[PDB]
Design an enzyme around this catalytic site. Structure first.
Site, PDB file in Angstrom:
ATOM      1  N   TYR A 164       0.828  -1.195   0.000  1.00  0.00           N
ATOM      2  CA  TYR A 164       0.000   0.000   0.000  1.00  0.00           C
ATOM      3  C   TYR A 164       0.867   1.252   0.000  1.00  0.00           C
ATOM      4  CZ  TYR A 164       0.847   0.462   5.076  1.00  0.00           C
ATOM      5  OH  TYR A 164       1.421   0.605   6.319  1.00  0.00           O
ATOM      6  N   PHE A 170       1.638  10.135   3.579  1.00  0.00           N
ATOM      7  CA  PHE A 170       1.661   9.940   5.023  1.00  0.00           C
ATOM      8  C   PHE A 170       2.103   8.554   5.453  1.00  0.00           C
ATOM      9  CE2 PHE A 170      -2.217   7.418   5.400  1.00  0.00           C
ATOM     10  CZ  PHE A 170      -2.903   7.759   4.253  1.00  0.00           C
ATOM     11  N   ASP A 171       2.133   7.567   4.563  1.00  0.00           N
ATOM     12  CA  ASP A 171       2.527   6.221   4.944  1.00  0.00           C
ATOM     13  C   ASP A 171       2.992   5.496   3.693  1.00  0.00           C
ATOM     14  OD1 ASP A 171       3.026   3.880   6.301  1.00  0.00           O
ATOM     15  OD2 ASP A 171       0.965   3.559   6.978  1.00  0.00           O
ATOM     16  N   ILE A 221      -9.226  -0.234   8.077  1.00  0.00           N
ATOM     17  CA  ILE A 221     -10.366   0.672   8.010  1.00  0.00           C
ATOM     18  C   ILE A 221     -11.391   0.170   7.000  1.00  0.00           C
ATOM     19  CG2 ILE A 221      -9.057   2.665   8.795  1.00  0.00           C
ATOM     20  CD1 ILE A 221      -8.734   3.405   5.829  1.00  0.00           C
ATOM     21  N   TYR A 230     -11.539   8.137   8.998  1.00  0.00           N
ATOM     22  CA  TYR A 230     -11.216   8.920  10.187  1.00  0.00           C
ATOM     23  C   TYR A 230     -11.972  10.234  10.312  1.00  0.00           C
ATOM     24  CZ  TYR A 230      -7.133   5.852  10.879  1.00  0.00           C
ATOM     25  OH  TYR A 230      -6.306   4.771  11.079  1.00  0.00           O
ATOM     26  N   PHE A 246      -5.202   5.995  -1.978  1.00  0.00           N
ATOM     27  CA  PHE A 246      -4.312   4.860  -1.774  1.00  0.00           C
ATOM     28  C   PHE A 246      -3.886   4.238  -3.093  1.00  0.00           C
ATOM     29  CE2 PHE A 246      -6.686   5.023   2.179  1.00  0.00           C
ATOM     30  CZ  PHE A 246      -5.643   5.032   3.085  1.00  0.00           C
TER      31      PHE A 246
END
Length: 107
Positions: free
Chosen positions: A26, A36-37, A56, A82, A99
């Site tokens: 991912y 962010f990731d 999620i 979120y 994503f």
């Protein structure tokens, strides 16, 4: 709302089911924002299964809507990840997530 934008190649038949453990490269992206990731940075490609509410909701529905080797593009609503709360320091409240998801799994 799950919106799949598929980069084509794969098989189109190896669908994720219950009792299956899947491996995903991912890459998270903020709309009008930066990364962010990244599973690619850690190079530990996030082994997980189906049906435990670990991930999620918006990522969970997009998983079964892919197949082996495919490369989709997620677009998650705020209410499924979120947006009411916002993940502290990492996700602001009422946010829209992007994503890059490739399913290179087993089982």
């Amino acid at each position: 709302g799950v919106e799949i934008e598929t980069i084509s190649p794969g098989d189109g038949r190896t669908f994720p089911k219950k009792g299956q453990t899947c491996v995903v490269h991912y890459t998270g992206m903020l709309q009008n924002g930066k990364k962010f990731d990244s599973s690619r940075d850690r190079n530990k490609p996030f082994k997980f299964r189906i049906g435990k509410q670990e991930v999620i909701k918006g990522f969970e529905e997009g998983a079964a809507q892919m197949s082996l080797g495919q490369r989709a593009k997620l677009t998650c609503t705020p209410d499924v990840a979120y947006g009411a709360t916002g993940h502290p320091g990492v996700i602001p409240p009422n946010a829209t997530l992007i994503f890059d998801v490739e399913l290179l799994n087993l089982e």
